[PDB]
Amino acid sequence: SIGVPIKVLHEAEGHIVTCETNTGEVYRGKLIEAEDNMNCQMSNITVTYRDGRVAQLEQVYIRGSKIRFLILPDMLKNAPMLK
Amino acid sequence: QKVMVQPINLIFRYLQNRSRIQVWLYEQVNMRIEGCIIGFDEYMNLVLDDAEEIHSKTKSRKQLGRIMLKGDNITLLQSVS
Amino acid sequence: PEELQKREEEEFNTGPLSVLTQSVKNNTQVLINCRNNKKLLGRVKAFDRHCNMVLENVKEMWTEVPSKPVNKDRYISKMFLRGDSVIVVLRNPLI
Amino acid sequence: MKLVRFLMKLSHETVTIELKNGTQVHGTITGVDVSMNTHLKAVKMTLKNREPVQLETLSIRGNNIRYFILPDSLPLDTLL
Amino acid sequence: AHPPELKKFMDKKLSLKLNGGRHVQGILRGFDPFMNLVIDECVEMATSGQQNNIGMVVIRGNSIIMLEALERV
Amino acid sequence: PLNPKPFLNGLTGKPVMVKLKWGMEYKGYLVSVDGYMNMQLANTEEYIDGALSGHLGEVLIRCNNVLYIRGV
Amino acid sequence: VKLTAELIEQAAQYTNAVRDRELDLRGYKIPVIENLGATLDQFDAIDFSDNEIRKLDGFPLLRRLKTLLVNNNRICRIGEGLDQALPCLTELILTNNSLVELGDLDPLASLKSLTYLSILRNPVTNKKHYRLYVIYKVPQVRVLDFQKVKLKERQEAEKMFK
Amino acid sequence: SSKMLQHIDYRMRCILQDGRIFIGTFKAFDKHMNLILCDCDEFRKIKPKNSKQAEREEKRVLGLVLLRGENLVSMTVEGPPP
Amino acid sequence: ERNKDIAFLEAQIYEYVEILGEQRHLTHENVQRKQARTGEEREEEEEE
RNA sequence: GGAUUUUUGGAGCAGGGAGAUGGAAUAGGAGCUUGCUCCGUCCACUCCACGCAUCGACCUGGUAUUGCAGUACCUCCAGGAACGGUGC
């Protein structure tokens, strides 16, 4: 099937999430779409670039195999999948 | 409504033209292995004819001949000609 | 099933893991390089497709910088070893 | 035959798992599954070049372990 | 084995971010379920400022970290 | 066209040089390559930095260490 | 009612408004602080509003703490060996207590990492040359009573009591 | 047995591959050992770079965290369900 | 002056092994019994 | 159910050079204690190449905004650089 965490990630789409890639760059933006293999596309990205350089990208697509973690919005803390 | 260039088509175009292909390496920014692609298979493992490593630091090219570069090392397939 | 069990024994007899098969045939040590640069000298009790190993009488040697780096070794008696950390298995070790 | 099935028939056995990030986790196995994730209790866990901390229980993922150190008092021929 | 949803990014100028800090830009021309991309007008930009136009490349998917849409998609 | 499994099947017995991803080189006659491309080489001299360094002889190389394998 | 681990285990444990780990101890009328080490060093800020704590003492070694909130208590004397047990503190909130003498603030210079202090609604605020004595006594504090320190205050802190 | 389900809803410390520490309320997991951690805080060890500088631990507050399973090394418990 | 502690130790290991001579015989018997076993017999003894 | 986004890992290792510079209270060897001489482990300062450039957090002074909102972060100028990571 699909696990509970990827279901939570799919619930998080449409909201502002924060990805950290494997290279340590922090991509905070609105999660447009997420995928079963944690491929995330985000709009309004503010990238940190691992030395502090916060730039603003629009419409990134992050490969899920490089995602270290995903800070989801805290308003999903009451989701019924988390129960 | 759009038609797609899937990458096996383009690696097979590299095969058909016998074009010398520069191959980048995964987690190895210094070395790029270039050679004429004779053939390749499912996991993007390639065989190369007159392949040579190009270390970008030393700017030296070491000739190898016919190699089988394993597919998981590949980052990019660049055509030099 | 049973045809896979005959297939795996003939494949482990003729394929690349033959030396591991040979290490369980006449019970001789193999020298195994690991991803953290530890050499393992020891017999193999059992193996699988992944080169996961169950090993006896293992001498793990490695080189540690404190200068000149020294060959600090340890003796692990019986062990299990995950197969993705195995680099190189050489069937006959010299010493 | 798979050797993860050999590892799953270990419970309340005190092993010392060396992880992939240079970690040494000495504890008794409470559970291993088919994906080699090992759940230990009474853990003395030493990170790389650090002091041994102790934890009540640990749950190591399967790919992150490098090797085991099994007890010497283990009949493995009956375990295989 | 589901393919990535890069149908927005097709025939649009991308800015890939490959591993090792490598950076290529170009028009995404195709993709597979492994996220191996095909890049047209691919310009490699190194740590030096000078940029090598390398034309038409196949990028293996496991080296891609990220891709920015330089067009609106 | 010459795919890697026909290339390795025609490569068996010949002296081949396997360069690992980590700078290690191995010159030996290729004995057997399975479909998962675990390679088995015989009479293998381990060459590091292009220099003859060890004689390992019979050897199994696991698949995920091989950068490339060539003929020599 | 005396404080034990029982009132620790049942109380609200959460993330505060400033996004640290918080244990709440409001409205317990605690006279003496003891047996805090059952929090297992998972906390950064502990509140103590509405307790009858006569002296801020009995503090065990908790390394992760960055805030103590001692709002509205009866602190007449202060503990001295606090820096050995709370090494990484940043805020000390000593509002609405009964500190009267200047030397009663003297143990607070031992906390090296201290940055924010609040000693409001205290008789020790009432005396002259107070704030300069706090700056000259505890130099590492950057915000005193929600007033940022200035270099004129540092200079007239160094000038007095030479 | 499904051992990780016993560790659910606890305050759990999760060790990442690069050395980070994730202390969060372990809400959910799956086959790949992804984690959902509520109120999660990350902890980076900081190299001292001097002979006399100490080694410090920088803590970031994160919130609701999806941790991809390929990053995870080992998980231990810190506390009861709050 | 230098080898004192080791020489005292060599005497203590001697006198303690004499006091534990029954237990030393029992370990040696147990090693010989554990060595001679099949797989299953070893696993069953490790369960006791 | 070991071949690119999760579980059989691309991980391991080392911090530039010099100076009749300084220290190993209880812990180096050799010239077979102590004093001296030599050599493969740090920190503090000085010199060359404050290792370099970048942005974020942060401290002093001056300065602008008096505004009802659910947040990567928020005025500007100048000095200092204790911290983080990026490429060489």
UniProtKB/Swiss-Prot annotation, chain C:
It is found in: Cytoplasm, Cytosol; Nucleus. Signal peptide: none annotated. Pfam families: LSM (PF01423). Residues 17-95 form the Sm domain. Residues 1-9 have a biased composition (Basic and acidic residues). Keywords: Acetylation, Cytoplasm, Isopeptide bond, mRNA processing, mRNA splicing, Nucleus, Phosphoprotein, Ribonucleoprotein, Spliceosome, Ubl conjugation. Core component of the spliceosomal U1, U2, U4 and U5 small nuclear ribonucleoproteins (snRNPs), the building blocks of the spliceosome. Most spliceosomal snRNPs contain a common set of Sm proteins, SNRPB, SNRPD1, SNRPD2, SNRPD3, SNRPE, SNRPF and SNRPG that assemble in a heptameric protein ring on the Sm site of the small nuclear RNA to form the core snRNP. Component of the U1 snRNP. The U1 snRNP is composed of the U1 snRNA and the 7 core Sm proteins SNRPB, SNRPD1, SNRPD2, SNRPD3, SNRPE, SNRPF and SNRPG, and at least three U1 snRNP-specific proteins SNRNP70/U1-70K, SNRPA/U1-A and SNRPC/U1-C. Belongs to the snRNP core protein family. This is Small nuclear ribonucleoprotein Sm D2. It comes from Homo sapiens. The gene is SNRPD2.
Swiss-Prot record, chain D:
Its main location: cytoplasm. Residues 1-80 are annotated as: Sufficient for interaction with CLNS1A. One of its GO terms (biological process) is spliceosomal snRNP assembly. The keyword Ubl conjugation applies. The keyword Ribosomal protein does not apply. Changing residue 60 to R: Loss of interaction with CLNS1A. It comes from the Eukaryota. It is found in: Cytoplasm, Cytosol; Nucleus. GO terms for cellular component: catalytic step 2 spliceosome; commitment complex; cytosol; methylosome; nucleoplasm; nucleus; pICln-Sm protein complex; precatalytic spliceosome. Changing residue 58 to K: Loss of interaction with CLNS1A. Keywords: Cytoplasm, Isopeptide bond, Methylation, mRNA processing, mRNA splicing, Nucleus, Repeat, Ribonucleoprotein, Spliceosome, Ubl conjugation. GO terms for molecular function: RNA binding; U1 snRNP binding. Methylated on arginine residues by PRMT5 and PRMT7; probable asymmetric dimethylation which is required for assembly and biogenesis of snRNPs. Residues 2-74 form the Sm domain. Core component of the spliceosomal U1, U2, U4 and U5 small nuclear ribonucleoproteins (snRNPs), the building blocks of the spliceosome. Most spliceosomal snRNPs contain a common set of Sm proteins, SNRPB, SNRPD1, SNRPD2, SNRPD3, SNRPE, SNRPF and SNRPG that assemble in a heptameric protein ring on the Sm site of the small nuclear RNA to form the core snRNP. Component of the U1 snRNP. The U1 snRNP is composed of the U1 snRNA and the 7 core Sm proteins SNRPB, SNRPD1, SNRPD2, SNRPD3, SNRPE, SNRPF and SNRPG, and at least three U1 snRNP-specific proteins SNRNP70/U1-70K, SNRPA/U1-A and SNRPC/U1-C. Belongs to the snRNP core protein family.
From Swiss-Prot, chain E:
CDD domains: Sm_G. Its main location: cytoplasm. It is found in: Cytoplasm, Cytosol; Nucleus. SUPFAM superfamilies: Sm-like ribonucleoproteins. Keywords: Cytoplasm, mRNA processing, mRNA splicing, Nucleus, Ribonucleoprotein, RNA-binding, Spliceosome. Residues 1-73 form the Sm domain. GO terms for molecular function: RNA binding. GO terms for biological process: 7-methylguanosine cap hypermethylation; mRNA splicing, via spliceosome; RNA splicing; spliceosomal complex assembly; spliceosomal snRNP assembly; U2-type prespliceosome assembly. SMART domains: Sm. Plays a role in pre-mRNA splicing as a core component of the spliceosomal U1, U2, U4 and U5 small nuclear ribonucleoproteins (snRNPs), the building blocks of the spliceosome. Component of both the pre-catalytic spliceosome B complex and activated spliceosome C complexes. As a component of the minor spliceosome, involved in the splicing of U12-type introns in pre-mRNAs. As part of the U7 snRNP it is involved in histone 3'-end processing. Belongs to the snRNP Sm proteins family. This is Small nuclear ribonucleoprotein G. It comes from Homo sapiens (Human).
From Swiss-Prot, chain F:
Coiled coil: none annotated. This is Small nuclear ribonucleoprotein F. Keywords: Acetylation, Cytoplasm, mRNA processing, mRNA splicing, Nucleus, Ribonucleoprotein, RNA-binding, Spliceosome. GO terms for cellular component: catalytic step 2 spliceosome; cytosol; methylosome; nucleoplasm; nucleus; pICln-Sm protein complex; small nuclear ribonucleoprotein complex; SMN-Sm protein complex. The chain holds residues 4 to 75 of 86 of the full protein. It comes from the Eukaryota. Belongs to the snRNP Sm proteins family. SmF/LSm6 subfamily. Its main location: cytoplasm. Plays a role in pre-mRNA splicing as a core component of the spliceosomal U1, U2, U4 and U5 small nuclear ribonucleoproteins (snRNPs), the building blocks of the spliceosome. Component of both the pre-catalytic spliceosome B complex and activated spliceosome C complexes. As a component of the minor spliceosome, involved in the splicing of U12-type introns in pre-mRNAs. As part of the U7 snRNP it is involved in histone 3'-end processing. It comes from Homo sapiens. It is found in: Cytoplasm, Cytosol; Nucleus. The gene is SNRPF. One of its GO terms (molecular function) is RNA binding. One of its GO terms (biological process) is RNA splicing. Residues 3-72 form the Sm domain.
